Design a protein around this ligand. Sequence first.
Ligand SMILES: [Cu+2]
Ligand SMILES: [Cu+2]
Ligand SMILES: [Cu+2]
Ligand SMILES: [Cu+2]
Lengths: 128, 128, 128, 128
Amino acid sequence: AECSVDIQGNDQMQFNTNAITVDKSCKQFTVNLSHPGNLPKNVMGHNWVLSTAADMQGVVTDGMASGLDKDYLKPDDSRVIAHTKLIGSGEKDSVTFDVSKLKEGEQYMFFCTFPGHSALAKGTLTLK
Amino acid sequence: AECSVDIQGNDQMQFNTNAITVDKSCKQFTVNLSHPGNLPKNVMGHNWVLSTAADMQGVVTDGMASGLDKDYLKPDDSRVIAHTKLIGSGEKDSVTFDVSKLKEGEQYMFFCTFPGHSALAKGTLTLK
Amino acid sequence: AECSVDIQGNDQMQFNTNAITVDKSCKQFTVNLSHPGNLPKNVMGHNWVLSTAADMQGVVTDGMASGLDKDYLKPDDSRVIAHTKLIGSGEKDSVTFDVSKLKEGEQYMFFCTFPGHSALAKGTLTLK
Amino acid sequence: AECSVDIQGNDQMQFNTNAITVDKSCKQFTVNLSHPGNLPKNVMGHNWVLSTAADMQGVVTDGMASGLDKDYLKPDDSRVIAHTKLIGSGEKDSVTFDVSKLKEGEQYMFFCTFPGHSALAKGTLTLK
Ligand SMILES: [Cu+2]
Ligand SMILES: [Cu+2]
Ligand SMILES: [Cu+2]
Ligand SMILES: [Cu+2]
């Protein structure tokens, strides 16, 4: 709703939304991430990473290899189209990206690369 | 925001929120349920049912035994503090209840009784 | 035992195993799927689909959108190495595939494509 | 078989079984829990906790509130029949409990109380 959306990751390992639609008339899109819980990020940390559906698995695996101090994301990973930092309850982070990076007819997924969170903390994103 | 909350159950079998806090000032609390996907009621129907944490297994068990035709809810189930109807994508329902029916100190859960849905589609609710 | 395995998917959305080793000496491999429970296909159907971990997410998304008549799988989805049928309480289905469809140094996943189940009904398959 | 069982919690948040049968003639029952993968206790610890299916939601909730130094278990929780302690990969722990604490007929669930894991790491236990 407009060119930005507010996403929350909570203490049950879930995102409040599992589907995002990005309007073609948006030059950029902004994702605002908050964490509505009471748990630290060493325990229940969440980021919002975006890649094609096909790349999801790879990013996730490489990322949990990198650890906390690297936000569970592989540095200079060319498959991550856009991402937030990893936060804990009470923290916030936003990222804006170019909608011209996405393309009509490809399937993208967004998820949390923190170990195992991606089973539930994921959702589709489409250019519409 | 105020004495009411908007909950949405989607196609990935989840609620947008897994924690609700009802303020003591509320005379009545309202829940507005929605189904943002595009899957039908028979495949992915969702309801919002409230019971003490203690009663959740029974309501959910007795409920899935009841069937689609009965919104998967034991008719006249006494353990059910409040509930909506089961809806499919595109539909809505609300339920309002007296806060006098809840008590401080007790633990309640809200959940969906459509077969298997309460594993992910559930949450806590407290009178604070 | 041999080049086959017997797997059950219950009314709680769980397969009875998380991992399947496929011995390199088998020419064909056969999975015999059963569904212990009282819930029907349309409500709790279970299939066993196999793909590389990388292709899984897309198989799932595309299958969700295919409908029951299609066993929630996309017709002629080239990413599906093999699959059973969607079966409900009390039914059985088997499938046999050539182990040459499999390469080692590839991670495989098995899962059910029925709406919302893939988060719980999944496991790994390794050509060992 | 007989009076013990060996279960594993992996790095995908899954137990290697979803059902356990406790022979009514065993006088004590021992559960051996190990943790295969590569991740640590704070990112993916697993404990083995047993309670009636009724009491499960409440033990799980009071548990995550208890913190990692309490193994995500409320102490002296009268609802916990038996439990191991939380362990990371590479670890192991056992618990032997008195089969006279169980009653045939009544349903039991075992599960991990680590934040958001019980949704995936859970199963039933029956006295036979
Ligand atoms: Cu996360
Ligand atoms: Cu539901
Ligand atoms: Cu299934
Ligand atoms: Cu665990």
